[PDB]
Amino acid sequence: GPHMASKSEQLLIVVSILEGRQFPRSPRLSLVVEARFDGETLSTDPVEHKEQPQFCTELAWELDRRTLHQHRLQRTPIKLQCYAVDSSTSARESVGYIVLDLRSVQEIKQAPKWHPLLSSKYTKLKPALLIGMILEN
Numbered sequence: 001g002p003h004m005a006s007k008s009e010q011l012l013i014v015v016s017i018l019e020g021r022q023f024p025r026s027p028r029l030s031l032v033v034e035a036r037f038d039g040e041t042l043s044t045d046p047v048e049h050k051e052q053p054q055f056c057t058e059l060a061w062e063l064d065r066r067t068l069h070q071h072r073l074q075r076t077p078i079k080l081q082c083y084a085v086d087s088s089t090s091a092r093e094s095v096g097y098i099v100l101d102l103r104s105v106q107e108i109k110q111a112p113k114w115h116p117l118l119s120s121k122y123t124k125l126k127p128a129l130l131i132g133m134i135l136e137n
Contacts, residue, residue: 008066013037013105015078016132017044017055018112022125025051030085032092033129035059037078038071046085055129060136068102068135075101082117082129096120096127105133 017033030046031053042059063071070076078100083092096117104110112132120127 006066008064010062010064011068012060012062012136013068013078013102014058014060014132014134014136015100016112016134017057017059017080018130018132019055020053020082020127020129021051021114022122022127023049023051023053024122024124025049026084028086028088030087031055031095032083032085033057033080034083035078035080037061038063038076046087049084072103075103077101078133080129080131082127084121093121095122098129098131100131100133102133105135107135109134 026049029049031049032044032046033055034043044055044057047053047055080098081094082096084095085092096119098115112130114128114130116126116128
């Protein structure tokens with residue numbers, strides 16, 4: 001009819017923020033990673049600003065397969081920013097960003113990979129995040 005409903009499988013996109021490398025050791029600071037996908041922001045809880053920070057957090061969004069297909073075609077990003085948080089002054093500062101896209105994410109799983117932070121505040125070495133991305137069921 002003139003109005004047509006749509007049905008497709010409900011899915012979870014799960015982004016795993018596993019760990020970092022090549023950060024400066026900063027005992028006064030912590031690190032938070034925030035991810036935004038399609039106007040929905042999720043954040044890790046602060047972890048120590050070690051050289052190899054242990055984020056160990058999954059961030060999950062729900063969508064259906066037809067909406068996912070559209071996001072692939074539009075190359076809708078999952079936008080990550082990494083923040084150094086200074087609890088002594090309740091301040092934070094972006095120390096770099098990563099842009100992920102879903103073009104390849106599938107049930108058929110892919111191994112996590114290292115993504116360097118772009119526009120990094122920490123210009124010695126190459127700070128990076130180990131990130132996994134999967135479609136769950």
